Design a protein around this ligand. Structure first.
Ligand SMILES: NC(=O)c1ccc[n+]([C@@H]2O[C@H](COP(=O)([O-])OP(=O)(O)OC[C@H]3O[C@@H](n4cnc5c(N)ncnc54)[C@H](O)[C@@H]3O)[C@@H](O)[C@H]2O)c1
Ligand SMILES: NC(=O)c1ccc[n+]([C@@H]2O[C@H](COP(=O)([O-])OP(=O)(O)OC[C@H]3O[C@@H](n4cnc5c(N)ncnc54)[C@H](O)[C@@H]3O)[C@@H](O)[C@H]2O)c1
Ligand SMILES: Nc1nc(N)c(NC(=O)Nc2ccc(C(=O)N[C@@H](CCC(=O)O)C(=O)O)cc2Cl)c(=O)[nH]1
Ligand SMILES: Nc1nc(N)c(NC(=O)Nc2ccc(C(=O)N[C@@H](CCC(=O)O)C(=O)O)cc2Cl)c(=O)[nH]1
Lengths: 289, 284
């Protein structure tokens, strides 16, 4: 039977590490870190996720605020608020929760966040630097996926990995992190990585997953990964959060009988996203990059 | 089938020449490409001369600025900055590899992004990885053009890329797997990235499934006929006289194959001409 990896337990540990780092930072005479989150509209999942982020901020001793705005806000109004926060020296980290309304360009918004406060790692320079394996602010969900694998001791060098999903904020960075050189400035996982997406035929997906030592599903499709697609002992990491009750992309009970490792939904990658954001916020407050 | 890289590059260069003539006939400045060349790498000199020959034939003015390998990083940076501010210069590229004492990423980032016809500037790398309009690196774009103009489908197909280098293998994988509907369209293929830590047996287990194998590793005979699915397309990006592919053997198994020389090589030069007219038009 498969080890269920508790993302909540891993994330709680990581937050204790950040809390100690923040306390030593403040005891050293530096200002306490402050995270600003901009929430637009009333997407219920977004409100939940931001509450988890502000909760975690309090846990690790980082000050925070959520600024909520109606979905009817204009792009220029969002850009003025972002510029205000860019110029407020008390704000160390700034993020705009996604998705945004159709009349607001996410890329222009993400690029307006000052790169030193870009705790999401969504600024184009951070994206470019990450794709060149340079030191960068790593996006929270891909980094939490990598940390799950690393802290569980699951090997990646020379191994076969399939990522289902190519979204720019989740699936593409996960594939970048896992396939790149371990020796570069920002090390990668040195895996052989297959990127699948909405136009991969289900039979070809299975033909690649059955070879995989790690399967990482970030598609948002319930029961996309089933026990027959997984080789025995493989690690399966479920990034999907599908409202159907919340399920992942993985047939949890089915794959649990064949995988070596498996993360649950909820309580797997989600809390890890929040913990890695805390790590990015103390990194931003320290002006390391 | 043996795809002629020379013939496709000829058509692309004719398209650029017509685009350049129309642009000049409408009263605009004639585009100008500046190439900086460091040292005496015989392949680099050969490649740069190919680039400047193609520029002339498509109506793009050019100059190669050659410096000794003993040049220092700050002196290369000075030359780049003067060229960045010379309004006659539309495109600027520094031929790689540079001498070991020069940081290539610092050099690539010093070229103004609007003149960065290589697409090596971090902002151009980032825009490419986000599927935004960008100057595409010429060799990866040449690979994609070979595939598209030969009419070889990508959407839903299995593609293996052998190599992960930031200038060639990674942009190739990026172009091929991404969404046809985005600003800069992609191939919508299922892409496997292999590299120097992919065991040989694992490479074959993936190529054997591939409708398109793209080899960009620089290893002679890395791709042999047993690894190839019958009827698949094999694109040899490696340059060794010989490519990465065992050309003679794979010729009998593949439905399409690309020779070395005269394959991807001339397409790289052709795609640079496209980027140069794009740069002159200041569309980005
Ligand atoms: N911390 C977390 O757990 C976390 C963080 C972010 C997102 N997510 C979840 O990830 C899922 C998607 O996230 P996103 O923001 O990347 O979504 P998105 O809608 O932007 O991307 C979905 C991706 O899935 C791919 N896909 C669709 N059908 C597929 C198929 N049949 N096979 C393979 N790939 C297929 C698409 O092509 C696309 O790349 C959702 O469940 C979302 O909640 C979870
Ligand atoms: N630079 C160009 O514009 C250009 C243009 C046309 C062709 N090429 C050719 O293609 C190559 C381009 O890559 P580069 O010059 O950046 O090379 P590089 O030395 O930076 O790396 C080549 C890649 O090959 C991979 N690789 C090594 N051994 C492998 C193996 N056994 N199996 C699978 N992958 C393996 C490596 O991990 C690496 O990603 C060159 O060697 C050249 O021959 C280059
Ligand atoms: N700017 C920006 N915009 C974004 N959208 C993101 N992504 C993001 O926040 N992801 C995210 C974060 C936390 C959770 C979480 O707490 N999950 C719990 C269940 C809670 C529940 O479902 O109620 C669980 O998994 O157990 C889940 C997700 Cl998807 C970002 O990082 N930056
Ligand atoms: N800044 C920067 N630096 C770089 N090094 C590159 N890459 C690059 O120039 N590649 C490149 C370009 C042309 C050829 C070519 O003409 N090939 C002929 C054979 C000619 C012969 O062998 O003499 C053939 O294959 O038929 C071959 C290659 Cl590898 C770049 O794009 N930008």
């Amino acid at each position: 039977e498969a080890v269920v990896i508790s993302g909540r337990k891993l994330a709680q540990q990581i937050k204790q590490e950040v809390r100690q780092e923040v306390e030593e930072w403040v005891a050293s005479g530096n200002k306490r870190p402050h995270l600003s989150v901009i929430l637009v509209g009333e997407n219920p999942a977004s409100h939940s996720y931001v509450l988890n982020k502000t909760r975690a901020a309090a846990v690790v001793g980082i000050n925070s605020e959520t600024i909520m705005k109606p979905a009817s806000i204009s792009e220029e109004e969002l850009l003025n608020l972002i510029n205000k926060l860019n110029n407020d020296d008390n704000v160390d980290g700034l993020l705009v929760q996604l998705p945004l309304p159709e009349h607001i360009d996410e890329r222009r918004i993400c690029n307006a966040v000052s790169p030193d406060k870009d705790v999401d790692g969504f600024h184009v320079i951070n994206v470019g630097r990450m794709c060149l394996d340079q030191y960068s602010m790593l996006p929270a969900t891909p980094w939490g996926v990598w940390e799950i694998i690393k802290r569980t001791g699951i090997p990646t060098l020379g191994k076969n990995v399939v990522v289902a999903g190519r979204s720019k904020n989740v699936g593409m960075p996960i594939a970048m992190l896992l396939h790149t050189d371990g020796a570069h400035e920002r090390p990668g996982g040195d895996a052989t990585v297959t990127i699948s997406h909405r136009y991969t035929p289900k039979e070809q997906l299975k033909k690649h997953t059955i070879l995989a030592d790690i399967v990482i599903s970030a598609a948002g499709i319930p029961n996309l990964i089933t026990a027959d697609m997984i080789k025995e002992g493989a690690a399966v990491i479920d990034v999907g959060i599908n409202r159907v009750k919340l399920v992942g992309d993985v047939d949890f009970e089915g794959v649990r009988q064949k995988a070596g490792y498996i993360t649950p939904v909820p309580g797997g990658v989600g809390p890890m996203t929040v913990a890695m954001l805390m790590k990015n916020t103390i990194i931003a407050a320290k002006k390391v990059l």
